[PDB]
Design a protein around this motif. Structure first.
Motif, PDB file in Angstrom:
ATOM      1  N   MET A   1       0.850  -1.179   0.000  1.00  0.00           N
ATOM      2  CA  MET A   1       0.000   0.000   0.000  1.00  0.00           C
ATOM      3  C   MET A   1       0.891   1.236   0.000  1.00  0.00           C
ATOM      4  SD  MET A   1      -2.871   1.656   0.683  1.00  0.00           S
ATOM      5  CE  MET A   1      -4.144   0.796   1.606  1.00  0.00           C
ATOM      6  N   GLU A   2       0.527   2.250  -0.790  1.00  0.00           N
ATOM      7  CA  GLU A   2       1.301   3.484  -0.870  1.00  0.00           C
ATOM      8  C   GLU A   2       0.345   4.651  -1.002  1.00  0.00           C
ATOM      9  OE1 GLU A   2       4.652   3.514  -3.594  1.00  0.00           O
ATOM     10  OE2 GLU A   2       4.628   5.730  -3.725  1.00  0.00           O
ATOM     11  N   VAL A   3       0.381   5.572  -0.047  1.00  0.00           N
ATOM     12  CA  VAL A   3      -0.596   6.646   0.027  1.00  0.00           C
ATOM     13  C   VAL A   3       0.134   7.980   0.114  1.00  0.00           C
ATOM     14  CG1 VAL A   3      -2.633   7.512   1.236  1.00  0.00           C
ATOM     15  CG2 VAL A   3      -2.109   5.052   1.256  1.00  0.00           C
ATOM     16  N   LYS A   4      -0.423   8.984  -0.569  1.00  0.00           N
ATOM     17  CA  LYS A   4       0.160  10.308  -0.616  1.00  0.00           C
ATOM     18  C   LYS A   4      -0.969  11.322  -0.678  1.00  0.00           C
ATOM     19  CE  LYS A   4       4.024  10.366  -2.750  1.00  0.00           C
ATOM     20  NZ  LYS A   4       5.229  10.500  -3.609  1.00  0.00           N
TER      21      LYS A   4
ATOM     22  N   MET B   1       3.308  -0.779   4.042  1.00  0.00           N
ATOM     23  CA  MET B   1       2.486   0.420   4.025  1.00  0.00           C
ATOM     24  C   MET B   1       3.408   1.634   4.011  1.00  0.00           C
ATOM     25  SD  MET B   1      -0.344   2.154   4.679  1.00  0.00           S
ATOM     26  CE  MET B   1      -1.640   1.339   5.609  1.00  0.00           C
ATOM     27  N   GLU B   2       3.070   2.646   3.207  1.00  0.00           N
ATOM     28  CA  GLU B   2       3.875   3.860   3.113  1.00  0.00           C
ATOM     29  C   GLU B   2       2.947   5.048   2.963  1.00  0.00           C
ATOM     30  OE1 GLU B   2       7.231   3.771   0.396  1.00  0.00           O
ATOM     31  OE2 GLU B   2       7.262   5.985   0.236  1.00  0.00           O
ATOM     32  N   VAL B   3       3.004   5.980   3.906  1.00  0.00           N
ATOM     33  CA  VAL B   3       2.054   7.078   3.963  1.00  0.00           C
ATOM     34  C   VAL B   3       2.816   8.394   4.035  1.00  0.00           C
ATOM     35  CG1 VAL B   3       0.037   8.011   5.155  1.00  0.00           C
ATOM     36  CG2 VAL B   3       0.499   5.539   5.209  1.00  0.00           C
ATOM     37  N   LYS B   4       2.285   9.403   3.338  1.00  0.00           N
ATOM     38  CA  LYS B   4       2.901  10.712   3.274  1.00  0.00           C
ATOM     39  C   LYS B   4       1.797  11.753   3.196  1.00  0.00           C
ATOM     40  CE  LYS B   4       6.770  10.647   1.150  1.00  0.00           C
ATOM     41  NZ  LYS B   4       7.980  10.741   0.291  1.00  0.00           N
ATOM     42  N   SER B   5       1.734  12.664   4.174  1.00  0.00           N
ATOM     43  CA  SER B   5       0.656  13.644   4.254  1.00  0.00           C
ATOM     44  C   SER B   5       1.249  15.039   4.422  1.00  0.00           C
ATOM     45  CB  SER B   5      -0.310  13.306   5.374  1.00  0.00           C
ATOM     46  OG  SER B   5      -0.606  11.913   5.392  1.00  0.00           O
ATOM     47  N   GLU B   6       1.015  15.943   3.456  1.00  0.00           N
ATOM     48  CA  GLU B   6       1.642  17.258   3.470  1.00  0.00           C
ATOM     49  C   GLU B   6       0.850  18.179   4.389  1.00  0.00           C
ATOM     50  OE1 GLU B   6       4.532  15.668   1.993  1.00  0.00           O
ATOM     51  OE2 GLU B   6       4.873  17.824   1.552  1.00  0.00           O
ATOM     52  N   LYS B   7      -0.251  18.762   3.906  1.00  0.00           N
ATOM     53  CA  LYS B   7      -0.834  19.943   4.536  1.00  0.00           C
ATOM     54  C   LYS B   7      -2.275  19.654   4.948  1.00  0.00           C
ATOM     55  CE  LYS B   7       2.042  22.989   1.646  1.00  0.00           C
ATOM     56  NZ  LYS B   7       2.513  21.882   0.772  1.00  0.00           N
ATOM     57  N   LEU B   8      -2.484  19.416   6.244  1.00  0.00           N
ATOM     58  CA  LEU B   8      -3.742  18.894   6.731  1.00  0.00           C
ATOM     59  C   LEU B   8      -4.324  19.909   7.701  1.00  0.00           C
ATOM     60  CD1 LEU B   8      -1.523  16.410   6.284  1.00  0.00           C
ATOM     61  CD2 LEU B   8      -3.498  15.041   6.965  1.00  0.00           C
ATOM     62  N   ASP B   9      -5.379  20.612   7.271  1.00  0.00           N
ATOM     63  CA  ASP B   9      -6.035  21.631   8.076  1.00  0.00           C
ATOM     64  C   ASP B   9      -7.399  21.078   8.495  1.00  0.00           C
ATOM     65  OD1 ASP B   9      -7.464  23.981   8.973  1.00  0.00           O
ATOM     66  OD2 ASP B   9      -6.233  25.297   7.685  1.00  0.00           O
ATOM     67  N   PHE B  10      -7.437  20.424   9.663  1.00  0.00           N
ATOM     68  CA  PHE B  10      -8.624  19.732  10.126  1.00  0.00           C
ATOM     69  C   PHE B  10      -9.233  20.525  11.266  1.00  0.00           C
ATOM     70  CE2 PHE B  10      -6.667  15.189   9.255  1.00  0.00           C
ATOM     71  CZ  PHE B  10      -6.643  15.437   7.902  1.00  0.00           C
ATOM     72  N   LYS B  11     -10.303  21.306  11.033  1.00  0.00           N
ATOM     73  CA  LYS B  11     -10.649  22.285  12.055  1.00  0.00           C
ATOM     74  C   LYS B  11     -11.748  21.765  12.986  1.00  0.00           C
ATOM     75  CE  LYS B  11     -12.961  26.163   9.522  1.00  0.00           C
ATOM     76  NZ  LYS B  11     -12.794  27.624   9.317  1.00  0.00           N
TER      77      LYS B  11
ATOM     78  N   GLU C   1       5.614   3.032   7.204  1.00  0.00           N
ATOM     79  CA  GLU C   1       6.448   4.224   7.096  1.00  0.00           C
ATOM     80  C   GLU C   1       5.551   5.433   6.929  1.00  0.00           C
ATOM     81  OE1 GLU C   1       9.807   4.018   4.389  1.00  0.00           O
ATOM     82  OE2 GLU C   1       9.893   6.228   4.200  1.00  0.00           O
ATOM     83  N   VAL C   2       5.628   6.375   7.859  1.00  0.00           N
ATOM     84  CA  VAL C   2       4.705   7.497   7.900  1.00  0.00           C
ATOM     85  C   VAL C   2       5.499   8.795   7.956  1.00  0.00           C
ATOM     86  CG1 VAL C   2       2.709   8.494   9.075  1.00  0.00           C
ATOM     87  CG2 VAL C   2       3.111   6.013   9.162  1.00  0.00           C
TER      88      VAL C   2
ATOM     89  N   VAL D   1     -10.672  17.548  17.267  1.00  0.00           N
ATOM     90  CA  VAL D   1     -10.079  16.672  16.275  1.00  0.00           C
ATOM     91  C   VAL D   1      -9.607  15.410  16.979  1.00  0.00           C
ATOM     92  CG1 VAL D   1      -8.239  16.460  14.535  1.00  0.00           C
ATOM     93  CG2 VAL D   1      -9.346  18.672  14.912  1.00  0.00           C
ATOM     94  N   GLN D   2     -10.027  14.240  16.490  1.00  0.00           N
ATOM     95  CA  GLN D   2      -9.451  12.964  16.900  1.00  0.00           C
ATOM     96  C   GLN D   2      -8.606  12.450  15.746  1.00  0.00           C
ATOM     97  OE1 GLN D   2     -12.587  10.295  18.135  1.00  0.00           O
ATOM     98  NE2 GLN D   2     -13.475  11.805  19.540  1.00  0.00           N
ATOM     99  N   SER D   3      -7.328  12.187  16.007  1.00  0.00           N
ATOM    100  CA  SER D   3      -6.412  11.713  14.986  1.00  0.00           C
ATOM    101  C   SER D   3      -5.699  10.455  15.461  1.00  0.00           C
ATOM    102  CB  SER D   3      -5.412  12.770  14.628  1.00  0.00           C
ATOM    103  OG  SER D   3      -4.412  12.231  13.763  1.00  0.00           O
ATOM    104  N   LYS D   4      -5.452   9.546  14.515  1.00  0.00           N
ATOM    105  CA  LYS D   4      -4.462   8.499  14.679  1.00  0.00           C
ATOM    106  C   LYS D   4      -3.575   8.499  13.442  1.00  0.00           C
ATOM    107  CE  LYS D   4      -5.709   4.698  16.662  1.00  0.00           C
ATOM    108  NZ  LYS D   4      -6.326   3.450  17.174  1.00  0.00           N
ATOM    109  N   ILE D   5      -2.260   8.378  13.643  1.00  0.00           N
ATOM    110  CA  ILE D   5      -1.309   8.367  12.544  1.00  0.00           C
ATOM    111  C   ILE D   5      -0.291   7.263  12.805  1.00  0.00           C
ATOM    112  CG2 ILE D   5       0.384   9.656  11.239  1.00  0.00           C
ATOM    113  CD1 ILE D   5      -0.972  12.263  12.082  1.00  0.00           C
ATOM    114  N   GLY D   6      -0.176   6.295  11.892  1.00  0.00           N
ATOM    115  CA  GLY D   6       0.807   5.236  12.049  1.00  0.00           C
ATOM    116  C   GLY D   6       0.509   4.350  13.257  1.00  0.00           C
ATOM    117  N   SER D   7      -0.526   3.507  13.124  1.00  0.00           N
ATOM    118  CA  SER D   7      -0.798   2.405  14.040  1.00  0.00           C
ATOM    119  C   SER D   7      -0.333   1.087  13.415  1.00  0.00           C
ATOM    120  CB  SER D   7      -2.272   2.376  14.361  1.00  0.00           C
ATOM    121  OG  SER D   7      -2.664   1.132  14.925  1.00  0.00           O
ATOM    122  N   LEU D   8       0.260   0.202  14.226  1.00  0.00           N
ATOM    123  CA  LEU D   8       0.657  -1.131  13.786  1.00  0.00           C
ATOM    124  C   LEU D   8       0.385  -2.115  14.920  1.00  0.00           C
ATOM    125  CD1 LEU D   8       2.049  -3.074  11.881  1.00  0.00           C
ATOM    126  CD2 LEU D   8       4.218  -2.131  12.473  1.00  0.00           C
ATOM    127  N   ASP D   9      -0.885  -2.535  15.043  1.00  0.00           N
ATOM    128  CA  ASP D   9      -1.401  -3.069  16.299  1.00  0.00           C
ATOM    129  C   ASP D   9      -2.035  -4.452  16.125  1.00  0.00           C
ATOM    130  OD1 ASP D   9      -0.586  -0.611  17.428  1.00  0.00           O
ATOM    131  OD2 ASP D   9      -2.630   0.234  17.376  1.00  0.00           O
TER     132      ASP D   9
END
Lengths: 74, 74, 74, 74, 74, 74
Positions: free
Chosen positions: D32-35, E32-42, F33-34, F45-53
């Motif tokens: 999986m690859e997400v951007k 898994m590979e994730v990349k998130s730039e600009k996240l404005d979650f209000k 990889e995050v 805001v509730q966030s989760k980033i990079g869980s491996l559980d």
């Protein structure tokens, strides 16, 4: 009966590399299940059963020269 | 009876590489299931059963020269 | 009966590497299950059963030269 | 003005199972690859991005009864 | 103006299971590979980013009863 | 103006299970990889980033009853 084995090797197996790097060996975990009942291995047997092996091999050079010489007289 | 084996090798197996890199070996996990009942392996047998193997091989050079020489007299 | 084995090797297996680095061996954990009932291994047997092995091998050079010489007289 | 909400539930959601078993969840690894660049999520937003999830759910029973009751008077 | 909310529930969500078992959750590793730039979650945002999660859920019973009751008067 | 909220619940969410067992949660290792640059998360805001559980949840019973009651008068 006159036999003269005079092989001559002036060869050069050579490499030049600049930067060698940024190498990532990251495999996700493997799943393996092995079951062996009745194994009668008698003479000159090489066996492997259930390998789960990760290798990273980054030689800077890694140049191989294999020579064999066989003189057989009968 | 006169035999003269004079091979001559001045060869050069050569490589030039600049930057060598940015290499990513990232396989998702494998699933393997092996079952072997009755194995009668008697003479000069090489066996592998159930391999699950990840390799990364990044030689900077990696040049191979294989020579064989066989003089057989009967 | 006159046999003259005069092999000559002036070869050079060589490498030049600049920077060698930034190498990451990071495999996720493997899962292995092995079961072996009745193993009758009598003569010259090499066995491996259930290996789960991580290797990193970064030789700066890593150049291999294998020569064999066999003179057999009968 | 007379309102009489008298619902009556004598229902039975029921199950009988004998042996429940021999269940094997064994998926080969996912890739999986997400951007995600510019995400402006302002009001009552539920998001999931990049899930890679294995579930095994073996309830012995697993019977669900959902009732809703809404009396709205204006 | 007379409102009478008299709901009646004598229901039974029920299960019988014999043996529950022999369950194998064995997934090969995920990648898994994730990349998130600009996240404005209000406002009121629920987010998940990059989950890689293995669950095994074997309730002996696992029966769910959800009731909601809403009386709204205006 | 007369409002009478008399809900009645005599329900039974029930389970019987015999033997519950022989459960194997054995996932091969995950690879994750995050990378998150600019995250402006201001209100609720509730966030989760990079869980491996990895979870194993084997309740003997595991029966859930959720009731909500809302009387809103305006």
């Amino acid at each position: 009966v006159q036999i003269v084995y005079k092989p001559v090797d002036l060869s050069k197996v050579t490499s030049k590399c600049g930067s060698l790097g940024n190498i990532h060996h990251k495999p996700g975990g493997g799943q393996m299940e092995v079951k062996s009942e009745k194994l009668d291995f008698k003479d000159r047997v090489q066996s492997k059963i259930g390998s789960l092996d990760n290798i990273t091999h980054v030689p800077g050079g890694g140049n191989k020269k294999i020579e064999t010489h066989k003189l057989t007289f009968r």
